[PDB]
Curated annotation (Swiss-Prot), chains A, C:
MF terms (GO), sorted A to Z: RNA binding; structural molecule activity
Name under which the protein is recorded: Capsid protein
GO cellular component: T=3 icosahedral viral capsid
Origin species: Turnip crinkle virus (TCV)
Cofactor(s) this protein requires: Ca(2+)
Amino acid sequence: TRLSAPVALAYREVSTQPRVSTARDGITRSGSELITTLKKNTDTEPKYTTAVLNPSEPGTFNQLIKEAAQYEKYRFTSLRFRYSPMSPSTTGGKVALAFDRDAAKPPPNDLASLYNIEGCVSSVPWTGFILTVPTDSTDRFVADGISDPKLVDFGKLIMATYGQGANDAAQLGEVRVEYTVQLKNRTGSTSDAQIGDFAGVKDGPRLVSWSKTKGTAGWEHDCHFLGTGNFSLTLFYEKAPVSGLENADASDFSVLGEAAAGSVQWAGVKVAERGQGVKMVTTEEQPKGKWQALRI
Amino acid sequence: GITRSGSELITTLKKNTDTEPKYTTAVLNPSEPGTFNQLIKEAAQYEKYRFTSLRFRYSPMSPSTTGGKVALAFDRDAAKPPPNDLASLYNIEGCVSSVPWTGFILTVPTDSTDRFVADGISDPKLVDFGKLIMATYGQGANDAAQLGEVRVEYTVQLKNRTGSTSDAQIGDFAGVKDGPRLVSWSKTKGTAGWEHDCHFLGTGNFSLTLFYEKAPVSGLENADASDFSVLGEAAAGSVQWAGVKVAERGQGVKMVTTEEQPKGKWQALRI
Amino acid sequence: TRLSAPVALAYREVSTQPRVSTARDGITRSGSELITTLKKNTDTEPKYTTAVLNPSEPGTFNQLIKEAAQYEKYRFTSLRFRYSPMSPSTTGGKVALAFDRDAAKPPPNDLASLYNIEGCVSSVPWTGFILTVPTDSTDRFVADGISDPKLVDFGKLIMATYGQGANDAAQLGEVRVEYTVQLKNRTGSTSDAQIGDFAGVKDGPRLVSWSKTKGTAGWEHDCHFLGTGNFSLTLFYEKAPVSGLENADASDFSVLGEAAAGSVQWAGVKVAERGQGVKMVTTEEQPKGKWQALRI
Amino acid sequence: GITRSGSELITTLKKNTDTEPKYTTAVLNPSEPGTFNQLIKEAAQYEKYRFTSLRFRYSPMSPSTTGGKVALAFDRDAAKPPPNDLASLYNIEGCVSSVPWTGFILTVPTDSTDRFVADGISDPKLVDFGKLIMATYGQGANDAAQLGEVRVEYTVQLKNRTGSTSDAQIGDFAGVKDGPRLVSWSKTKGTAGWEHDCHFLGTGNFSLTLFYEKAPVSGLENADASDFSVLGEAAAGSVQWAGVKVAERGQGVKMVTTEEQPKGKWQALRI
């Protein structure tokens, strides 16, 4: 029979209270976080935005990272993502949420493959839906350095948007996690400041992801920030580089320092959307030095 | 024997701004590239099937202010051509229609008979389980470009087993063709000469390689494909390697030789 | 009190199963059919579209025609028309359904007269309504040739649209019959292919309706098709005409034949909307020949 | 979820006159072209597996007058090099051997742990179930050229469906590879220039297409493949399209050039 269509739907969101408790082996923390807000995509093919599901991941969790710094292993006993619409009912396209159990595989390339992923749900941008992912009973190590994501990460969420019109809402919605993790073991509190050289060494929370790319001037190392917020980045060059730190696509980038042998720079980068970063240029592939990312 | 449930995207319906309804069909056979993109790989290794459970879903994609309608019906005779008037379509058993901005479902009762996986030359009444008819009509000029997506949620029982069928459809200009029915060529004489053009029955990224024994009038050229990029060199005794992106069925590329049934070889793949 | 207005209303339509049964005198068939889809009318005065209510009428019934070819008389024990909206709630104008018990009277000429018809219902294009027509207990002959519609036809439905804006939905809705006919008597199965000459003879289902019109070149006979679908039309000219068969306002017209004395043509006309047809020109009023309409 | 059973053909063993074993391993992962020729296509659609059952049958093919021995062993570590002496080979759990003209079967007890489908980059200890080792030795100087064959009868549970991986391998001479690991490239500075060798890790009919930005010194040449038919001409901006039939793993085709990293792209295919 008849089924009406509203002009818009309003969801009231209130920050709940995390439920912490103590068990025999560790603690059991429940809560909810905000990952990101989906943006309009005026193209038929999807545009993806990923978020690795693992405590101590600044991009995904904001408060569970601190509570997971005191523990060594985890087990997501129950997690579930929710979508809150903030666009009228006259917006086209679609929104798709899928959970890839492999955290290294890149997101698919065509819409047909996106729908083959198990559990992939989707709906119109102006209505809310929930994707609940079955969990398992395997303990994994909280991220601590450069390790295979198959061995530490539980999975990776994939958010896609497509099919929206030209004159549509700028932002369609926002995803929200609802987890219940089982932190186990215990250890001396670990610092939260990724530190590593340019030879592929990393030690700490995954705040940064460097990527070389050969160019006419030299090898360009791009410091992509996985989270969204205020960061600081100290660099130490052993050999004089072609150029210091430059704003690639981030917002409000400032650097106090100089580029030269033995010199140290100090950049207070600011990120408005996950993936933005800075860049530097050198003539030596795999240069010698250090860097330190921090959430300041 | 193997049971493989799943869900796949057949196509995405598009606006019908003209007056006559537009009908798009998709034969329900596990080896059909038009309707299946993942079960085809599994069915290539089997020579019998039975659809334990079949059902189709329509997922809206258009604004709430979209006119017209969309219909979904299942015809058990895969040979019959698509209907000619709307009343006959609505007279098919279990035909479900609704406005573009809302989704619905169409459950297809299934029998307990086995059929040979399609090879492309057998009677459709003997191999195919049926076909699906998707109708779109009554849309104005102010409506969205895309209405929705049709998907098939199935549960097949592939039986027996055999040598895997070739993943690439090799063939020969105006001659024999082997492998999955990915493309189909056609010829029409013209001013420059005989024009050979191919049509891609599937949708996705393809890879067409060609070999000319004699210098053609012209090399590969986009006809109506979404994207196109040739990387070869048209000439006598040469090969042209091209990549074609197809958004809707029937899109393809073309060539000119001026000699009917030119001697050569072509290969098609769904990269 | 308050009464909300949706952006649009969605009606789910599923093809039901006809209910056939056997009685003492014949059979009693129940079912539902689709007549047509109403189109926008950006004019104050109405625009009409008629459908004669009689089994063996290709324009109205599509499946009951076959079941009524084996019977001689009928009685609509219960019929009722329904309107399904497929336009947003921002469309103006109105839609009117009326049942004229005289199947020959032309539709009215002004909106005032349309509302004097008994039982005439109407509503906004974006909402559904039902017009149920009282029936009687009189048996009538199933249409078989050229006969007075007062004697064979039960009635005639009239559908009108008007008042829509310029930027409104192209099509407003679609009507749908819901009948319960009582077929009686019985006879050898009759063919479905109207056949007749140009002297006013017709024998078979009412698929075509010729109409003369004097012109400068000659008398033009227009072959209006009452239904909508694929048709074929074979013509036989005894005297050479001015011109053969030409596409008047139909779609996808093709003819295999020649125009000359004794020659025969064969036109596979195709109709997208009821009323479209082809035409031919002759210098002789009431020419000698034959024609045969068929649903191929 | 899905469960499949099959019986593939790994390889055919060859005579070894030397009394010391000559090993040929075969990593056991569903997405391994060297081992599985049909399971790879359905494993590309899933990202986890669990071998419920597993056996390796050696089917003799040599006459009754051939000496020596043939041994099949299963090493649960897929990175350990094959042993260096007979005693170490026979210390492996479950190792079974016999004279070439007598058949035997090796049953490998399984476990209840799910492993990620191999990507070729991850640790073999973390994604590979094991590694089969086949050895031969002691044959006389006038025995049959090729001994029996080896087949794998399995029952694998694939889980966690996902987007299908490309069925054709597309790569670049700069070290880029994205596909089902069907080919490997190497460099060896000869006398005419940097020579690129293309060793096929599978066994069967193939199809290699290359695009040259600059004219190479020479086109594809049959290094040790059973068959090789090249189509097209080698030159600047040209494309070649060869069909190679491979009977033993490692057989490849050479192409010499004056540049260590020639600009272009290739495409391997198991036609």
